[PDB]
Write an enzyme that holds these catalytic residues in place. Structure first.
Site, PDB file in Angstrom:
ATOM      1  N   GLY A  44       1.483   3.227  -0.170  1.00 47.53           N
ATOM      2  CA  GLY A  44       0.595   1.789   0.173  1.00 47.53           C
ATOM      3  C   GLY A  44       1.610   0.696   0.090  1.00 47.53           C
ATOM      4  CD  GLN A  49       3.520  -4.623  -1.942  1.00 43.52           C
ATOM      5  OE1 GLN A  49       2.778  -4.032  -1.386  1.00 43.52           O
ATOM      6  NE2 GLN A  49       4.336  -4.277  -2.980  1.00 43.52           N
ATOM      7  CB  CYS A  90       4.330  -2.468  -7.895  1.00 43.25           C
ATOM      8  SG  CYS A  90       3.551  -3.569  -6.849  1.00 43.25           S
ATOM      9  CG  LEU A  91       7.245   0.048  -3.314  1.00 47.26           C
ATOM     10  CD1 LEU A  91       6.887   0.194  -1.850  1.00 47.26           C
ATOM     11  CD2 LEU A  91       8.608   0.753  -3.747  1.00 47.26           C
ATOM     12  CG  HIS A 133      -1.743  -0.912  -6.247  1.00 56.57           C
ATOM     13  ND1 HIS A 133      -1.258  -0.516  -7.443  1.00 56.57           N
ATOM     14  CD2 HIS A 133      -0.900  -1.622  -5.698  1.00 56.57           C
ATOM     15  CE1 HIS A 133       0.045  -1.022  -7.429  1.00 56.57           C
ATOM     16  NE2 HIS A 133       0.185  -1.645  -6.384  1.00 56.57           N
ATOM     17  CD  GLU A 134      -0.976  -1.417  -1.661  1.00 51.16           C
ATOM     18  OE1 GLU A 134      -0.469  -2.437  -1.110  1.00 51.16           O
ATOM     19  OE2 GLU A 134      -0.331  -0.666  -2.327  1.00 51.16           O
ATOM     20  CG  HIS A 137      -0.256  -6.243  -3.434  1.00 59.33           C
ATOM     21  ND1 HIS A 137       0.454  -6.759  -4.399  1.00 59.33           N
ATOM     22  CD2 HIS A 137      -0.036  -4.672  -3.383  1.00 59.33           C
ATOM     23  CE1 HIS A 137       1.305  -5.716  -5.026  1.00 59.33           C
ATOM     24  NE2 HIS A 137       1.103  -4.528  -4.144  1.00 59.33           N
TER      25      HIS A 137
END
Length: 170
Positions: A44, A49, A90-91, A133-134, A137
């Protein structure tokens, strides 16, 4: 066609993202988000991000290996059931993970697709966790904030040096 991914410490990750209104360029933007996600080996990626405070994320269930591709604008969770702890990273916080992030087991989500068309979707298990999670953000939330306070504090103490490093780099 990839974008740099913003690291922990960039304030864009903490803003409340704005609703998408003009969908004319969303397909193309979403394509670059997917290319970014895929190159970083994620499942995702949210618009914040890549520096864009818009209520948009992409996710998948390597473009040729996916079962389903989701382009999700203006998501709202309208139902949740259950509570399951699980592993997330998480990236924007590369290499950092918690194994005990609580999430709803099942959700219903209202959203618009890349053409602006209203959709309703129900997800369970892994993909419900990815969507939670997305969506988080877009509300300026990161996964460790979902941990109960003692566990959140332990996570931030344990990873303090790496968190500092990200912020400097951001």
């Amino acid at each position: 066609m990839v974008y740099p991914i913003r690291l922990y410490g960039d304030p864009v990750l903490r803003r409340k993202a704005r609703p998408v209104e003009d969908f004319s360029g969303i397909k193309r933007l979403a394509e670059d988000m997917l290319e970014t996600m895929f190159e970083a080996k994620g499942v995702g990626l949210a618009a914040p991000q890549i520096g864009l405070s818009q209520r948009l994320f992409v996710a998948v269930e390597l473009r040729e290996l996916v079962r389903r591709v989701y382009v999700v604008a203006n998501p709202v969770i309208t139902y949740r059931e259950g509570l399951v702890e699980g592993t997330e990273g998480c990236l924007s916080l590369p290499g950092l993970y918690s194994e005990e992030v609580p999430r709803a087991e099942r959700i219903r989500v209202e959203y618009q697709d890349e053409e602006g068309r209203g959709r309703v979707l129900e997800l369970e298990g892994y993909m419900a966790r990815v969507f939670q999670h997305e969506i988080d953000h877009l509300d300026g939330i990161l996964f460790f904030e979902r941990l109960p306070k003692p566990k959140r504090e332990a996570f931030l103490e344990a990873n303090r040096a790496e968190l500092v490093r990200f912020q400097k780099e951001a």
